[PDB]
Design a protein around this ligand. Structure first.
Ligand code: K74
Length: 326
């Protein structure tokens, strides 16, 4: 398996672009940035609104929990490489506490509204609009040789007043090398691609498109998360029971993958269940023909069949968004 677009990006670029292990961090000044209030947390970091004391400009301060140097350099290198791209969070500085050596990444401030609260307020048009903005970011990172590998609403910061979107948390992100084979324990559970749940390791940018399709199905059908499985095996069952097992079996044999007796056992046998079955009164104002056609083109087992980010941006679904922009 190789990517159908942008397969040769890191091949033509000089080694220093993608050789993140050879980066030497140029640590800024811890004191320039003061923590103002906690705004979030996850498995690998704590996140604070901050102030730059030099210029009194707001910022985001990401304090990293203890992390291997290899892996923080990967996140730093990817951030530097994408800094300035459309809707990509901007890294501004990297600093460390002198005593304990605990690193903090400093970013542009985005006044986010949490998705659990934001997304049920979105009109059919805002959904179009914000999904388009997020597609610009994925196209750009893909065109630069990078897979984000952790697309989810928690990783998409939205200032809904400025109509502004940033893709954040590049901590699971990786450079793309044709036919290189990758760790499958990436993404977060509800957003993992079939490729991940079946041990297909030579995956690519297309993995972020599955994750975007999960996010999008969540939004138009008002069902967050869309595929709600308890552990990884349960995750593939939840998908199978929507896409049907027939399509899974053809996927499995194209890429020559055997599905582990117990997993095979768990998945069983299922009809495909039409996208229209998820329609109800709460969600009806969001589930038009064009939304479904687009969703159907993202949530395909076969990662090679999914639309690329550049294709998605052209689909008739976003025609009003393009026209406003042009
Ligand atoms: C692991 N999950 C979290 O930390 C969620 S809370 C949160 N993390 C943020 C990060 Br990182 C950046 Br960068 C920016 Br900009 C904003 Br705004 C963030 N907010 C609100």
């Amino acid at each position: 398996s190789k990517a159908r677009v942008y397969a040769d990006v890191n091949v033509l670029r000089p080694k220093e672009y993608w050789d993140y292990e050879a980066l030497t961090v140029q640590w800024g000044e811890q004191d320039d940035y003061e923590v103002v209030r906690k705004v979030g947390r996850g498995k690998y970091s704590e996140v604070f609104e901050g102030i730059n004391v030099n210029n009194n400009e707001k910022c985001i301060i990401k304090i990293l929990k203890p992390v291997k140097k290899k892996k923080i350099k990967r996140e730093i290198k990817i951030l530097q490489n994408l800094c300035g791209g459309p809707n990509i969070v901007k890294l501004l500085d990297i600093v460390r506490d002198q005593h304990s050596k605990t690193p903090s990444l400093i970013f542009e401030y985005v006044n986010n509204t949490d998705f659990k609260v934001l997304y049920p307020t979105l009109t059919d048009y805002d959904i179009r609009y914000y999904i388009y903005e997020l597609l610009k970011a994925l196209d750009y990172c893909h065109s630069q040789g990078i897979m984000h590998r952790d697309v989810k609403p928690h990783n998409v910061m939205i200032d809904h007043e400025l109509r502004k979107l940033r893709l954040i948390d590049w901590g699971l992100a990786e450079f793309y090398h044709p036919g290189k084979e990758y760790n499958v324990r990436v993404a977060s559970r509800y957003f993992k691609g079939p490729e991940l749940l079946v041990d297909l390791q030579d995956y690519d940018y297309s993995l972020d498109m599955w994750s975007l399709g999960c996010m999008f199905a969540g939004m138009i059908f008002r069902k967050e998360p869309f595929f709600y499985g308890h552990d990884n095996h349960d995750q593939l069952v939840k998908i199978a029971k929507v896409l049907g097992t027939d399509g899974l079996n053809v996927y499995l044999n194209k890429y020559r993958i055997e599905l582990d007796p117990q997993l095979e056992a768990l998945v069983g046998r299922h009809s495909r269940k039409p996208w229209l079955k998820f329609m109800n009164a709460d969600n009806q104002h969001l589930v038009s023909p064009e939304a479904i056609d687009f969703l159907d083109k993202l949530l395909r087992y076969d990662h090679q069949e999914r639309l690329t980010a550049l294709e998605a941006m052209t689909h008739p679904y976003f025609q009003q968004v393009r026209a406003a922009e042009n």
